[PDB]
């Protein structure tokens with residue numbers, strides 16, 4: 001589909017058996033979701049945005065579905081104010097910027 | 100053009116007769132640039148990101164070129180880690196997300 005940017009590009013994602021709303025963010029290196037439980041091992045990581053850094057848990061090889069498109073990748077979990085889908089997963093669903 | 104997301108979508112912009120590198124950020128509502136000088140009076144604004152909020156200076160009706168596409172709009176200036184082109188200007192250049 002073609003998503004305009006008049007409003008924030010929010011979409012529904014399916015992860016860990018849960019349905020969440022997330023922001024398609026081309027300015028995000030990684031994908032970070034609000035506090036939730038995920039299977040497997042994890043490693044701590046510090047990620048920085050405007051305002052500074054926050055500590056998150058890093059889970060690798062996590063299955064996720066965005067707008068019907070299945071993908072696998074690293075998912076960070078921590079105190080983010082909004083669910084963000086970053087470039088690591090946007091590439092997998094074939095998302096591109098056009099103008 | 101069509102920009103993939105395997106790497107950061109960094110582009111060249113021109114403002115105040117100077118070239119700068121900026122990030123095309125669909126997750127950003129506004130456009131914020133690193134400390135610089137701009138004409139006219141500015142208004143106060145607080146913008147929130149991953150690690151919190153930062154105070155910025157808001158300048159309106161500023162001429163800015165993005166990838167050669169001329170735009171005229173609001174540009175924020177403050178302690179941002181990187182130059183960010185947000186939806187206010189992405190919409191002016193006709194940028195959309197596609198997959």
Ligand SMILES: COC(=O)N[C@H](C(=O)NN(Cc1ccc(-c2ccccn2)cc1)C[C@@](O)(Cc1ccccc1)C(=O)N[C@H]1c2ccccc2C[C@H]1O)C(C)(C)C
Pocket residue numbers: 023025027028029030031032047048049050081082084086124125126127128129130131146147148149180181183185
């Ligand atoms: C590489 O780091 C990242 O990719 N960081 C990502 C990141 O923060 N990305 N970017 C730009 C941005 C880009 C780089 C840096 C940064 C900071 C320190 C060192 C190196 N880079 C900071 C902000 C900004 C993000 O879109 C992320 C975001 C989205 C939604 C809610 C909160 C935060 C954002 O900050 N959006 C806000 C913004 C930006 C400019 C003007 C107004 C506004 C309002 C908001 O729209 C992250 C943490 C999701 C994975």
